[PDB]
């Protein structure tokens, strides 16, 4: 977090911090049909907008 404050004041950021919903870092796998290979956790959250 100390690193993020350094980047904030050098290229005009405005941030807000919220942790991940579950806890897992991220992994691609299929759920409930063996044919839905997709990310999860933080890695899934980034690609979801």
């Amino acid at each position: 977090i100390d690193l993020l404050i350094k980047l904030a004041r050098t290229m005009n950021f405005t941030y807000e911090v919220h942790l991940v919903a579950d806890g897992k870092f991220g992994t691609q796998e299929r759920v409930n049909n063996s044919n839905k290979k997709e990310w999860n956790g933080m890695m899934g959250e980034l690609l979801s907008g």
Partner: protein, 387 residues
Amino acid sequence: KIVNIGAVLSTRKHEQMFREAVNQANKRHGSWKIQLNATSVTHKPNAIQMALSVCEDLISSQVYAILVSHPPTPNDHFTPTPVSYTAGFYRIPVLGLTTRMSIYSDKSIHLSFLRTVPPYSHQSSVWFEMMRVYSWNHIILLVSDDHEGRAAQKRLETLLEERESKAEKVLQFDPGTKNVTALLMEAKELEARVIILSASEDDAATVYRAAAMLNMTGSGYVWLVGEREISGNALRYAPDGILGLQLINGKNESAHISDAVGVVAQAVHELLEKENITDPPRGCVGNTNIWKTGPLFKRVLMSSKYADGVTGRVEFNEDGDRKFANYSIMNLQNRKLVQVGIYNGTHVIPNDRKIIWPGGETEKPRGYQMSTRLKIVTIHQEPFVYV
């Protein structure tokens, strides 16, 4: 020989002078065994008698190529299906003149049908380079849930893939819904400053209606629409500074036959050198089996590219649709229409007249914006991120 070839054309006067258009083609052709004749019938702008007013006089006349016309009602697409279905079984070609939808382009049905005018979906091809010349990397796409709209979004997304673009965001609009302001405002969260639209007459008005209270007409926005949105029942609430496209000479059905009769008349010239040149059996009742020479007749059609007539340079091939189409770039200003460019088929040719944008800004806003507020993500880890 007297070959009765015509069409079910509306605008009786238009088919009246078409009776002498063949005479012009009669002199040009040097063929001897064939003396094509015009036996047309009046249009039927209703579904009552199409059970008995399609082949009852055309196939019995031993037709080879059938043109088409348009009814006075602008919202109509049932006209070319009953004629196409009969020609689809017999494999005898038919020619589309006023045909404009993308339904008669997939060729999955109506195996024998030729088009002299590109369908409305083809406007997306020229649209691909339209913003690329003026930078505008980011766009927002929103179309009505229509088959033509489905084709336009399918072709463009298969056209912008060469630029390694992901089309930013795509929105879907279902025809017949009015309270759609909630859907519209979701696009405001995007950084893209390019707005495109391809909808119907009823959808164009309500979309423009929702663009008033939300100050889309304000400065910093660009709008691109098809020719179906500049004209018709959409100028009541049309936002200013629209860079919509426009078709040229496509409505001149009087000049339609000038290029229509040239290709077919000279097509038989190459055909009168092979075998199996036999007319289909007479009538529409006594013939229950198709003659062997079916789609072989078409095989001589796309090979004919004659640059003659009022428009000229017609090169129908591939999908049975015209190549190197011509459209005029149009800009709407203070409820007035002024040309600002023209697309000859390959590249864009603008006009000296100043191009305007909504809000009166002479400068062209960049089709992009930046957000200074970001949302970060972190995970509980001991030495790095205490919680």
